[PDB]
Design a protein around this nucleic acid. Structure first.
Lengths: 171, 98, 70, 65, 104, 141, 53
RNA sequence: AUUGACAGAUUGAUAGCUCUUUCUCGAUUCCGUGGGUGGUGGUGCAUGGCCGUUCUUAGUUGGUGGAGCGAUUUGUCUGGUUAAUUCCGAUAACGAACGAGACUCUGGCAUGCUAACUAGUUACGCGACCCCCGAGCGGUCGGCGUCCCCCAACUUCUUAGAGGGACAAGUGGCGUUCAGCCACCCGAGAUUGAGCAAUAACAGGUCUGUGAUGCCCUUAGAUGUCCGGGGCUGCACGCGCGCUACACUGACUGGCUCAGCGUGUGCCUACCCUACGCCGGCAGGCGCGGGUAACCCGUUGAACCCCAUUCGUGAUGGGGAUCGGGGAUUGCAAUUAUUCCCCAUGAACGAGGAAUUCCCAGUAAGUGCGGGUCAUAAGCUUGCGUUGAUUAAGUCCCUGCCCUUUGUAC
C-alpha cells in the first residue's frame, strides 16, 4: 500500500513481469501467430500491446479471447479491475519477424511437411519480405535416429560485433 | 459432483463469475489467491479444474508454475447444468468494446 | 598514503605554475616549469597508470589459478 | 608494428579522393572535417582513419600519379 | 500557491531519458517559471555474474550481466495544473517518473 | 599554535602525562585483567594505558566530531589472526571505549552532542590546545 | 493429516525455489530475482540485463 | 455405496496406521478396463536448448569463368608487408559472402560547454557561535568543529550528459622510395583492458535447470509424496585446487594514518542495513533513532604500511595444529564438536626430493575490504581498490599452433 520498493528492485521486477508475460503469451498464442508484447504503464492504467499476424484469431469471436487474457493477466499479477488492457496490433512485414517465422516453421513441421521443403519455403518467404540475409537451422533427428542437422542459409549475415544485437532478428 | 460441497461449488461459481480462472502450482496454500471465503485452498481448486479439463469443460496453459484456465462454451453449459442456473446468466464475456 | 603524497606533490607544483601563468607573467612560469620537469615529469604531468581489472580464472588480472593437469 | 589500414578504409579514401580531389589537401584536420561532410562515415574513429590515409595519398599524388 | 515541485525521472535507457529531461525543460521555459538544471544522479550498475554452463563441467567461464539505471531529477517552482500538462507529455519509453509535491 | 601544528605521536605522550598529573579521571577496576580487544594476544605492556588511550580518544574527538563508542571501536580496529585461517578486521573493545568517554565526561573534556555521539567541550579544548602549545615550545627539533 | 507439510519451512533452500523451474539450487536471489541461474540466463535479456562487459 | 473418527492397547509420533467402539460428508465411494498421472528413475550413444573444446589462432565459403574422365582444383598466390587470407602487388580468373578489423562497454585528457540542498559547497563573506580554542600585552592572524539558511558566488574537486580528442598526422631515416617498419617532436604514440565472435566438427558435458523432451521403467505394500531418524562429514591409505607458516626485511603492546567496487528492510512468503546511549571483560544484551538510499549506515576513519614496544636466533614471545573446561548468538533442533568469545593445551614445520604451475606495467607478489551462497556463514569464488618489484622486449631448443613444399602401405 505504502511500500515504494527500491529503484533497483523495481526495475528488475518490471522486467521479470515483462519476461513472464512474454512467455505466457508465447505459449498461449503459439499457433495464433504471436510476435511480441510492448507494455507501457500510464496514469491509473496499463496498456499492453500484443503483436501478431492473425489479429482476428487473438481477439476472438466478437470480442472474447482478449477479454479472457486480460482477465487472466488481471487475476495473475495482482492488478485491480480496469487498470489493464490488451491491445492486439497487427505485425508489419511478418517475414522480418523471426519468432513469427520460427513458429511458422514449427507449424509446417508439425503439419508433416518435409524437413527440407517447409524450411526452404520459410527461407524464401522471409527473403522475399526484404531482409539483408537469413540463417535457418532445423536440427535434431531429421530421419534415422542419429541427430543430424540442416542449415538452410542465404544472403548477408553478421555474427560478431555489437551490430548483431540490433541488426539481426533471432528466434 | 465430488468432495466437500461448499468448497467445490464455490470454485465453480468463481470460474463462472470470471470467464477464466488461475491458481499457482503449489499444493500448500491454505487460502488460495482471491476467493478466500474459508480455507478453500490451492488444491480443491487445482484438482477441480483438472476434473473439468479431462471431461472437456475447461482448457489449459501452464507458463511459469501458475496455470491459466480458459473456460469452453461446452464447459459453460455444464457449469449452468451443475448450478441449475437461468438461461440468461451472463458469465463474463459481455464487455462493451467501442 | 604513498598515493596521497605524490598527489599533493603534483598539485602544489601545478598550482604554483597556474598562479604565475595568471598573476605574474608567462616568462617566469616558463622557467619554473622547466626547473620541475628536468627534475621529474611527474610534477606536472600525472601518470595515466591505473589498477587493471581481475578476470575470472585467476587471483589477479594476469595471474591464472594453478593448472592440475595430472 | 601494427597499424595497417583495412580495405574498408583504403577504398573509401580512394573513392573520396576521386570525387573531391579539390577540397582535400595536405593538412590532416582540414580534410578530416572534409571527410565528415561529403561522406556518411558512421564511426568517428573510421572517419579519422579514412582522413589519415586521405592525407597520405594526397602527399603521394603531389609527387607523380 | 506556488511551491517547490520536484520531478524524478529514472530509467534504464540513457538517450530516451535525456530526451524526456530536455522536453521537461522546454515545457518549463515555454510556461516561464524556473528549472535548476537536470541533476545527473550517479548511475547504479545492477550486476549479476554467473557461470556460463548449466552443470559443472566445461572450462570455468563466466558471463557478466550488467544492468544500468539513471536518475535525472529536476526541480521547479510552479502550480499543479502546469505540472500535469508537462509530465503527461514525454511518455511511451521506459522512463519512470515520480513527481514529489514539496521539500520531502 | 593548534594541535594540527604538532607531531601527533609526541602530543599524546604529553596528554596522557597531563591526565596522570591531574589525577581525576576514573580508571576502572579491570585495567590489569582486561584484554583491550579480541584481536589481542596480550594485555598492554604500558600498565598505565587507560591514560594513553583516553588521551588518544580525546585528540581524535578534537579532529573528528560526533564520535560515538561504535565510532571509537572502528578507530581502534585492526587485523585478527584466526591463526591458520586468513586474517580479518576486528573492531576495538566496546566497554573500554565507553569507560574512556565516560571518564572524559566526568573530567568535562567532553559533552554528548545533539544528533547523538560525543564531542569535546571548550574546557577540554583548553587542555588539548594548551598542551600543543607546550609541545611546540619544547625545542626547535 | 495435520502433520502433512508440518516441518519448519521458513529459512534455507527447503523453502526458496525458482519462480520458473522451481528447482531449488543455484538461485539468483539478489535484487529479488529468485530464479534458477540457468533460468536467469534463459530470460536475462527480457529482464533488462545485458552483457556489455 | 462405504469419504472422514477423542479412546485405551499398540506406536517414535498428540500417524484414527491398526484392534474395541464413535458415529459421519451424504452421492463422495470401492472394482475392472481403457486410461492417465507423477517421477533428483534409466538412457546425454534416442534428442532439443545451453555450455565447453578442437581453436584465440587466421581461418572458411559458394556464383560464374578456366584445368582435370573424375574425386578435386583454381579463385583462396612467388615475393614483401601486417596482430591478422592485414595490405601492396602479382595473376585463368572476375566479381562477392562470413571471420579479422570496424563495432559495443571500459581506462586515462579536457580551469571547454551543460549541471546541481540526495555533490562540493568552493573559495568568499566570515554573519557568526564558541570558549582562551591558541599565537600574542592587545590588534591581526592559524586551526578546525561546525550554526547557517537563502534573497552569498561558482564548478577547481563531484556526479554524468552531449561534444571534442590520436590519425602512425608530423620531422628524420629504412623500405620497389607502394604496403609498411624504426626512431624523435608535440603530447595518451598505431598497443588500457574486456565484450561480441566464422565454417566444419565432438557420437565433450548436461535427461540432477526446466510444465524442452522420445522411448524404456515404475506406479498404492509406489522409484509418487510427506513425516521421524541416520547418511553424503564414516579412515590402513593415494592424488587435486587451497589457507597458515617456518620468523627479527620479524612478533607482540601501544600510537599515527589513507581506499575503491558494492549491499541494504517494509520481499514470491518472513524477514534487511544499521548510527547514538546504557549493561557485560568478550561473544553479545537492552533501549531508542535514521535508512527502498549521491539523503541513513558513511569524511565507508580497511588492512598491509608508517612511528615508538619489547623480545634476541632458543621449535624462541616464531608456528597455532590437536585437546580439557566455561560462556555467547542462529535456530524446531547443533551430540558426530553450526558459528563467535574466553582461559588453558602448545604438534609437525628451521624454506621443501624427482617433479611441475602462473605471470611482462599498476603487471606478479604482498594487503585488506565488498558481492555470491547466507537463519546461522568462507580456508571457495567473483569484483574492488592500497603497497608495488625483478626480468624480457626475444627464439623456435622444449611444448604446441598457422601456412607452403614434400613423403606416406594411415
Amino acid at each position: 500500500m505504502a511500500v515504494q520498493i527500491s529503484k533497483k528492485r523495481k526495475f528488475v521486477a518490471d522486467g521479470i513481469f515483462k519476461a513472464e508475460l512474454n512467455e505466457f503469451l508465447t505459449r498461449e498464442l503459439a499457433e495464433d501467430g504471436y510476435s511480441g508484447v510492448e507494455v507501457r504503464v500510464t496514469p491509473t492504467r496499463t496498456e499492453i500491446i500484443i503483436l501478431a499476424t492473425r489479429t482476428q484469431n487473438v481477439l476472438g469471436e466478437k470480442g472474447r479471447r482478449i477479454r479472457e487474457l486480460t482477465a487472466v493477466v488481471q487475476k495473475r499479477f495482482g492488478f485491480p479491475e480496469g487498470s489493464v488492457e490488451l491491445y492486439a496490433e497487427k505485425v508489419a512485414t511478418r517475414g522480418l519477424c523471426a519468432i513469427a517465422q520460427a513458429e511458422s516453421l514449427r507449424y509446417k513441421l508439425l503439419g508433416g511437411l518435409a524437413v527440407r521443403r517447409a524450411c526452404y519455403g520459410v527461407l524464401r518467404f522471409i527473403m522475399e519480405s526484404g531482409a539483408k540475409g537469413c540463417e535457418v537451422v532445423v536440427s535434431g533427428k531429421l530421419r534415422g535416429q542419429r541427430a543430424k542437422s540442416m542449415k538452410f542459409v542465404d544472403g548477408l549475415m553478421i555474427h560478431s560485433g555489437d551490430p548483431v544485437n540490433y541488426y539481426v532478428d533471432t528466434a | 459432483m465430488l468432495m466437500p460441497k461448499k468448497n467445490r461449488i464455490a470454485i465453480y461459481e468463481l470460474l463462472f463469475k470470471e470467464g477464466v480462472m488461475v491458481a499457482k502450482k503449489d499444493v500448500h496454500m491454505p487460502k488460495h489467491p482471491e476467493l478466500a471465503d474459508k480455507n478453500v485452498p490451492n488444491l480443491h481448486v487445482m484438482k477441480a479444474m483438472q476434473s473439468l479439463k479431462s471431461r472437456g469443460y475447461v482448457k489449459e496453459q501452464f507458463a511459469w508454475r501458475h496455470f491459466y484456465w480458459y473456460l469452453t462454451n461446452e464447459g459453460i453449459q455444464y457449469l449452468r447444468d451443475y448450478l441449475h442456473l437461468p438461461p440468461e446468466i451472463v458469465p463474463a464475456t459481455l464487455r462493451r468494446s467501442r | 598514503h604513498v598515493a596521497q603524497i605524490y598527489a599533493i606533490r603534483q598539485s602544489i607544483s601545478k598550482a604554483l605554475v597556474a598562479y604565475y601563468q595568471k598573476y605574474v607573467d608567462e616568462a617566469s612560469k616558463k622557467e619554473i616549469k622547466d626547473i620541475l620537469i628536468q627534475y621529474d615529469r611527474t610534477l606536472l604531468v600525472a601518470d595515466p597508470r591505473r589498477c587493471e581489472s581481475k578476470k575470472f580464472g585467476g587471483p589477479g588480472a594476469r595471474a591464472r589459478y594453478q593448472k592440475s593437469y595430472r | 608494428m601494427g597499424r595497417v589500414r583495412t580495405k574498408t578504409v583504403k577504398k573509401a579514401a580512394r573513392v573520396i579522393i576521386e570525387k573531391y580531389y579539390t577540397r582535400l589537401g595536405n593538412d590532416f584536420h582540414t580534410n578530416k572535417r572534409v571527410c565528415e561532410e561529403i561522406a556518411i562515415i558512421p564511426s568517428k574513429k573510421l572517419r579519422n582513419k579514412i582522413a589519415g590515409y586521405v592525407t597520405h595519398l594526397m602527399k603521394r599524388i603531389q609527387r607523380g600519379p | 500557491a506556488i511551491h517547490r515541485i520536484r520531478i524524478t525521472l529514472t530509467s534504464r535507457n540513457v538517450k530516451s531519458l535525456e530526451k524526456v529531461c530536455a522536453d521537461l525543460i522546454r515545457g518549463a521555459k515555454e510556461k516561464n517559471l524556473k528549472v535548476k538544471g537536470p541533476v545527473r544522479m550517479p548511475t547504479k550498475t545492477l550486476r549479476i555474474t554467473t557461470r556460463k554452463t548449466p552443470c559443472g563441467e566445461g572450462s570455468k567461464t563466466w558471463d557478466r550481466f550488467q544492468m544500468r539505471i539513471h536518475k535525472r531529477l529536476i526541480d521547479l517552482h510552479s502550480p499543479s495544473e502546469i505540472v500535469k500538462q508537462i509530465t503527461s507529455i514525454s511518455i511511451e519509453p521506459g522512463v519512470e517518473v515520480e513527481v514529489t509535491i514539496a521539500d520531502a | 599554535v593548534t594541535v594540527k601544528d604538532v607531531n601527533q605521536q609526541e602530543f599524546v605522550r604529553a596528554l596522557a602525562a597531563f591526565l596522570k598529573k591531574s589525577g581525576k579521571l576514573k580508571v576502572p577496576e579491570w585495567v590489569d585483567t582486561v584484554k583491550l580487544a579480541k584481536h589481542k594476544e596480550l594485555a598492554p605492556y604500558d600498565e598505565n594505558w587507560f591514560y594513553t588511550r583516553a588521551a588518544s580518544t580525546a585528540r581524535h574527538l578534537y579532529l573528528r566530531g560526533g564520535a560515538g563508542v561504535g565510532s571509537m571501536t572502528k578507530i581502534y580496529g585492526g587485523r585478527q589472526r584466526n591463526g591458520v585461517m586468513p586474517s580479518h578486521f576486528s573492531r576495538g573493545s566496546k566497554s573500554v571505549a565507553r569507560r574512556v568517554l565516560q571518564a572524559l565526561e566526568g573530567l568535562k573534556m567532553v559533552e554528548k552532542d545533539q544528533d547523538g555521539g560525543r564531542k569535546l567541550t571548550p574546557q577540554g579544548q583548553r587542555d588539548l590546545d594548551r598542551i600543543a602549545g607546550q609541545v611546540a615550545a619544547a625545542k626547535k627539533k | 493429516q495435520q502433520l502433512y507439510w508440518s516441518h519448519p519451512r521458513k529459512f534455507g533452500q527447503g523453502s526458496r525455489s525458482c519462480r520458473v523451474c522451481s528447482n531449488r539450487h543455484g538461485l539468483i536471489r539478489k535484487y529479488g530475482l529468485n530464479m534458477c541461474r540457468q533460468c536467469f540466463r534463459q530470460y536475462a535479456k527480457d529482464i533488462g540485463f545485458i552483457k556489455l562487459d
